Amino acid sequence: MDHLPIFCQLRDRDCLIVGGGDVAERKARLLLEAGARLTVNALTFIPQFTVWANEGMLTLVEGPFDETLLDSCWLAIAATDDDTVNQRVSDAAESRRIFCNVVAAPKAASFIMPSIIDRSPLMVAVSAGGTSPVLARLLREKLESLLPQHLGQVARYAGQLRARVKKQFATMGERRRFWEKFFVNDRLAQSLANADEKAVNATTERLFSEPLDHRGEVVLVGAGPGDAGLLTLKGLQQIQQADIVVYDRLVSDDIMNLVRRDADRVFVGKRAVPQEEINQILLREAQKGKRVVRLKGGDPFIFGRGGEELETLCHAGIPFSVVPGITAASGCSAYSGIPLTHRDYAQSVRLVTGGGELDWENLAAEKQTLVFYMGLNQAATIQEKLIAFGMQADMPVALVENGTSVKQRVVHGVLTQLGELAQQVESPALIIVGRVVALRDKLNWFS
Amino acid sequence: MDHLPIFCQLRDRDCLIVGGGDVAERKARLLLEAGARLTVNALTFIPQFTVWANEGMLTLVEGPFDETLLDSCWLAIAATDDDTVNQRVSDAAESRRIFCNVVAAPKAASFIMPSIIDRSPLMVAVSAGGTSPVLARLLREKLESLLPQHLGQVARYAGQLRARVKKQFATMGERRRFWEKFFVNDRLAQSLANADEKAVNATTERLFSEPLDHRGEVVLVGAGPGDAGLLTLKGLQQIQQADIVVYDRLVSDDIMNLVRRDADRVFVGKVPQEEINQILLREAQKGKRVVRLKGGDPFIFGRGGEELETLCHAGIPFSVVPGITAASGCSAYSGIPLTHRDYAQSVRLVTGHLKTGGELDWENLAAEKQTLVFYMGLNQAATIQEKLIAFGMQADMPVALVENGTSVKQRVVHGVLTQLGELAQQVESPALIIVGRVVALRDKLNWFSNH
Ligand SMILES: Nc1ncnc2c1ncn2[C@@H]1O[C@H](CSCC[C@H](N)C(=O)O)[C@@H](O)[C@H]1O
Ligand SMILES: Nc1ncnc2c1ncn2[C@@H]1O[C@H](CSCC[C@H](N)C(=O)O)[C@@H](O)[C@H]1O
Ligand SMILES: [Cl-]
């Protein structure tokens, strides 16, 4: 430790930036977010500064550097392109004992500005002293993955709640157990972000009433189509906080390698298990006060039977939420360079499954993009019917298997070849029909 | 933000602690490790101060608070059990514009001391600012598990190499590609921790020798419909590393706070299409990392094709990260599942207005067993009501408009088809129109909020 990190309260304190270009604008925004009473000294300003000055948000002083602008200041920043000026500013502040930063130069400055993760009042700052700014960027990326946006909201609420955390919890050990289910109860977090100050109470007293070991909720989470990068932030946060993960084949191992190692896993997909057993497993492991995560390929509410799994839980009074995901259509479209819409090619995208019967004349109408989920088997009779109902036989067709994954296969061509091309693939695969499939020869950036 | 974190260089700068107990000792240890010229001024001192002064590491002043002792200082810590004394200290630091800390009063004074995770020269600082100390330790301990031990050695060796990297690579782009390869090299990390110099050099020489890609790139990122938690991991990596971010009206302020602070942002809302094409094409010419940040998914009514079509021929590398489309987002947050059993066998994503001429194929849209989702159809609600009824759709078919779906300003109004026109008047862009029997599932699956 040769830098001491301190968290400064800058609201209504005079702070000086010397320089009027892009780098000053990024430091000025930073210091404006924190409530500095800010002056900016420069030989000229990029328009964004003249805007801020008109909204009364800071003060501009045009001209050369005047060291008297430091007379009543608490922090200084050199952010010009002239090392002579920066050196003058740096030297004017050391004799006044104003902490000072030189953007150009970590050395020869009395403070360094780190990377920040803002969740006010909660804050995390990362630096390595000027040695490795990229490595701090990498740390900041990861930390932004991991901290819910609304954690600051719950941070705050914990404030005037420490009152009650003693007249209903005696030992410091149980006191921390409560605190631990507090900061992870996203139903409280969403309730606070959405100002719903009755969902907030109903969950505040459910936290003081229910036994200390009970945290029973269900979270339906979309895994996305296969690529672990295609998970959502809230999705990742949720599978970090899960007591149990109930998952099937359609969830990739890359996604499962993200699930906390000290967490129960129930494999529920197939081997070589009807819907209602899955419903009972979820119900069962939630009534035991465990935080359940149901992980499903793609998006839960698109052919995932997500609806069925949540109406089993609405009977028994079990909280739940849904974190959506990338359905296969979106992924496969993007990772094969076949946009579902483009210009006036198609007025509508149709996501269709493969009792009752499919309406055939509807599927042949022009100005559509047909996307068939679970249709490899019925693929034979699909080419027959579309031709029989008047679709042009030169209509491009594409089948995308293991979309977005490091083994993705794409097979394209023409509607007349549809039956031949469906043997060349296996589940999970997507049939895409329409004129946009011709775009892959210019847009395919994956293979 | 309520505090601005900075990292002070304390070597040879005077600081005052006032008070002399177990608290004062802890802060004094912190300031001594940071190389400060320390004065402690207290009425009595626990033994640890006595020993520190013996070895000539701080100056002791036994007596009541001496304001003049501030006159030379960069930081003051008030650390006594007397609030009256602590405030006199805070008031003397304020008149001299010296950042001051009061251990008993996080809300008074000028700076707060965070918890520290040392991986010197790597440091992570955590604080909830006094509101939550429990979450501080809970976060601090979790962070302690994520950062390896050898992260310090990698970082120390990175600074030693920083001079060589600046002479050898000319532009900013290729130093960036050097450092990205450097910090994800697990072999190079183990060789430093094992103090194996022959292996450090071998890997270092090969790295300096690799040709680096000088080209820029453009990445279409789907921002999702609004909630910042619905961005994808890949999409966070792109905007956390991007040089320029071209964004539009339909990207929320919460998503934009996730862009790298030292990147420039160009707005394209209210600008036509062929201009966006060129501004992208122009900003990628400088060989920078251009992110085009689009609400929703970029291939569902975002004209992501038009943008990338230029660059297949202009020799620019590009790729696309998909996003949560407004349909998937609004369904999950309205309680309205898009499919369900055989309520619907298919889901239609439809545009609200066509290319001037051309009529929507209402015969097709009117078909049974499908969920209908109209994008940017608000201003045409009344005609969708008419036409659908004209082409067979029943009258009591439920409908829902999800205005601003997935944000904290989300409104949802529902009804039946014959009310579609008046429902649209009490909503504003951006809104989605959902039509079909899955809308009835709302009163059982709504978990988000009663608006
Ligand atoms: N990675 C993938 N590549 C190609 N098709 C996929 C896929 N993942 C899922 N699918 C398609 O989706 C079907 C599973 S049923 C629905 C999947 C999920 N609810 C989603 O939103 O995508 C499979 O039959 C297959 O047609
Ligand atoms: N958060 C939101 N809530 C409701 N409708 C939204 C929305 N975000 C986008 N939309 C709809 O999308 C239209 C723009 S078209 C671009 C959307 C993008 N292709 C996607 O996948 O989402 C808007 O007119 C609006 O009708
Ligand atoms: Cl650094």
Numbering used by the authors:
A (entry chain B): 1 to 272, 277 to 358, 363 to 455
B (entry chain A): 1 to 270, 277 to 457
Can I see the authors' text?
Siroheme is the modified isobacteriochlorin tetrapyrrole used by siroheme-dependent sulfite and nitrite reductases (SiR/NiRs) in catalyzing the six-electron reduction of sulfite to sulfide or nitrite to ammonia. CysG is encoded by a gene fusion between a C-terminal SUMT (CysGA) and an N-terminal bifunctional dehydrogenase/ferrochelatase (CysGB). The C-terminal enzyme module, CysGA, is homologous to a well-studied class of SAM-dependent uro’gen III methyltransferases (SUMTs) that catalyzes the methylations to generate precorrin-210,13.
D104 has been implicated in its chelatase activity but its exact role is unknown. Alteration to alanine results in an enzyme that cannot complement the cysG deficiency and is inactive for both dehydrogenase and chelatase activities. The D104A and D104N structures were determined to ensure that there were no gross structural defects that arose from the alterations that might impact their function. Indeed, both altered enzymes were crystallized and the structures are largely similar to Met8p. In the D104A structure, there is a slight movement of the DAPK loop in the closed, but not open, active site, highlighting the asymmetry of the active sites. In CysG, the D104A variant is catalytically inactive for both activities, supporting the idea that the side chain serves as a general base to facilitate proton abstraction in both reactions. D104A CysG is deficient in both dehydrogenase and ferrochelatase activities, whereas D104N activity is only partially reduced.
